Design a protein around this ligand. Structure first.
Ligand SMILES: Nc1nc2c(ncn2[C@@H]2O[C@H](COP(=O)(O)OP(=O)(O)O)[C@@H](O)[C@H]2O)c(=O)[nH]1
Length: 214
């Protein structure tokens, strides 16, 4: 067994490869020898963003006690970073918002189903989720507080449309979706801005948030 794992999840173009590169400077090929993994005491596990390949990642999130197979060999999953392009989110057609929120919906619903799976009465270990709103260096980037409200409204729209036509994300009696409501399933979900390149807040706040929780 190695250091614990953090799954890095998100649509293509979000900056996952770039983030992993910054961090360093089925089964997963991971450089254990990387200075970033030794100094922070966790492994950052890049996953594919292509829609056809998301099922594999979601399967880890359903498991009451997920361990990742790591090829430099079992690592405990302790957190998720969901990375998105905060600039692409600002597009007028709303396409990126919709497709990104759809993925996030599945990620959170998977962790919710995990919480609810009780082959024995005991609650599973917590897996917090950092929604990392990347590319804040760009002038067109949506700020984290707006990323939060836009995502919440879209996740709300999805659950309402699906119920009209478990599939329901969040609390049964919730009338307006909020990430905070996921604490009913001991799921801490927070939206935080940052950037991997360019001038801005950088990535350290993301690393701190994860570090305090694993
Ligand atoms: N402006 C800006 N561009 C970024 C940032 N992070 C990544 N990128 C760029 O976004 C593109 C997609 O990044 P990549 O790591 O390949 O994304 P991936 O598909 O999620 O693995 C690349 O051109 C990166 O250089 C950022 O914080 N700001």
């Amino acid at each position: 067994t190695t250091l614990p794992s953090v799954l890095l999840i998100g649509p293509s173009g979000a900056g996952k490869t770039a983030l992993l590169t910054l961090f360093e400077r089925t089964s997963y090929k991971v450089d254990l020898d990387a200075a970033g993994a030794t100094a922070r005491k966790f492994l950052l596990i890049d996953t594919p963003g292509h829609p056809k390949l998301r099922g594999t990642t979601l399967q880890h999130l359903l498991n009451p006690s997920p361990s990742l197979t790591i090829i430099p060999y079992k690592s405990k999953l302790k957190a998720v970073i969901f990375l998105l392009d905060a600039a692409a989110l600002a597009d007028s057609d709303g396409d990126y918002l919709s497709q990104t929120a759809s993925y996030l919906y599945d990620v959170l619903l998977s962790l919710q189903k995990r919480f609810h799976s009780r082959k024995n009465s005991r609650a599973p270990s917590s897996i917090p989720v950092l929604i990392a709103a990347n590319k804040q260096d760009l002038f067109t980037a949506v700020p984290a507080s707006l990323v939060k409200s836009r995502l919440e409204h879209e996740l709300g729209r999805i659950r309402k449309t699906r119920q009209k036509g478990e599939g329901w994300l969040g609390a049964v009696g919730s009338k307006e979706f909020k990430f905070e409501e996921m604490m009913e399933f001991d799921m801490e979900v927070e939206v935080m801005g940052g950037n991997v390149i360019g001038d801005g807040p950088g990535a350290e706040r993301w690393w701190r948030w994860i570090g305090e929780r694993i």
